[PDB]
Amino acid sequence: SNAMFCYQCQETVGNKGCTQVGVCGKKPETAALQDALIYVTKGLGQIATRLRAEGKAVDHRIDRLVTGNLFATITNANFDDDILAERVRMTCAAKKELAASLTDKSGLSDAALWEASEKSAMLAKAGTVGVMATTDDDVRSLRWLITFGLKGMAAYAKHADVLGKHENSLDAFMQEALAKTLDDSLSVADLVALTLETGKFGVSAMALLDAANTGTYGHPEITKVNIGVGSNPGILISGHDLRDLEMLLKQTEGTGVDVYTHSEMLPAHYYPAFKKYAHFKGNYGNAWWKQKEEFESFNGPVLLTTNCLVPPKDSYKDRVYTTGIVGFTGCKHIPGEIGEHKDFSAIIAHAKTCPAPTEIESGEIIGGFAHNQVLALADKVIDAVKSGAIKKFVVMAGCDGRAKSRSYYTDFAEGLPKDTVILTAGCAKYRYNKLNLGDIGGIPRVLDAGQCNDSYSLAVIALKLKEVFGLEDVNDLPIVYNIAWYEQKAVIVLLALLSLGVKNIHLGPTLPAFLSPNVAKVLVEQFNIGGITSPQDDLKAFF
């Protein structure tokens, strides 16, 4: 008997499932608490959906509980059992109160009705409500594909909410879709439909977050980002939340403490508002998975605004600070998941007692090619395609990870002919954004649109090109998709692209373990999804 079962990320054991301990470090009781939390969140979703159908209000506090719950269970987000158990209690309390408001309680699921306050009872329940609770391979596969897409959607929705933007249709959809994943009456056809609908609301969530980010901090613009370091004490901010950065920059003004970004905070440099803080230094290091080395050499405190946090080495654990829904037992936490004032005074004081960062590399990288910036360059991009200067774009967006096989993405990028342009977003970029790939007529051969959510900009750009060229099908553009995935945000990006009609996506370095043979067949037959082989073979075959 397995102590746990989790298969939601690319690194799952054997591309089958983590059954003893997660490759990410997630322990079985942590995994169990997350399974219980997801179950009661789906129950809450049913109750909220039923209230809306009865014409009754559902407060936005409930929406926030749902998004925080989903995000807390995303890969590398929260390993803190005390926090996870308390989210289970809060969810049980909330859904019991909401159910009291229903006129008709008929048909409420066990997830809607079940509750526990004792951790032991949560762990026992978890054992019978995990992935394996669904017997049927295709229904199971689609339920979990949808659930994972919803987690990614919720993450993006939550960042938009932190910045003051929320849409009732989006929160209502997430809650309804969660509930549908426990409805045994839905057919495989119903669940394939729901998968595509999930992709559509993925686009909606990304659009909302794009509007929130750009509306608050300006549209990204071309930017040179220093990757070397200064000589002052610093704080390294990681994850994705731009509001946390704004507060940190404001509070470090005049202190003598510099602020550096890491992994998915790199794109903050591209926003005009952040360029007005003189102590906002560069981007330090590479993608999340190198952090045991890079957080050590940074020397100063590190703030995780979201995933990915890897279980920290004892050498720097005392200077790791979590915030939002991030957690790790024994790491200091700065409270807040709604963009409210956060007091960074302790992290600033801590930074002053640490050495300045140890430099890993020097120079700069260029980015800021999000939708406004690229549409401003559209005529020139179009002219370069028409003249043959740009023969192909390769979308290499997505999420990086530890696997040795990901050398493929570096080698593929290096081996591309010099008449191609790489479009990127998300930490997948680190496999090739430190190479020297040049330019085509002044256009850099790597165009970084931003965070994984800024894959939205890549879709907007592709749709603009489709319009200008007068094409009937987006797939007739000279674009190859060679996307790397790791966790559930990458999953929603993939579903979003499928909902937009993008075919021929090459996904890697492996295909998700949660795709059953029949579900994978639908994706191949209707969307021509494929995987990777060697970089040299694919450099021939993909073109």
Ligand code: SF4
């Ligand atoms: S999040 Fe990934 S590595 Fe961690 S337990 Fe789940 S499948 Fe395994």
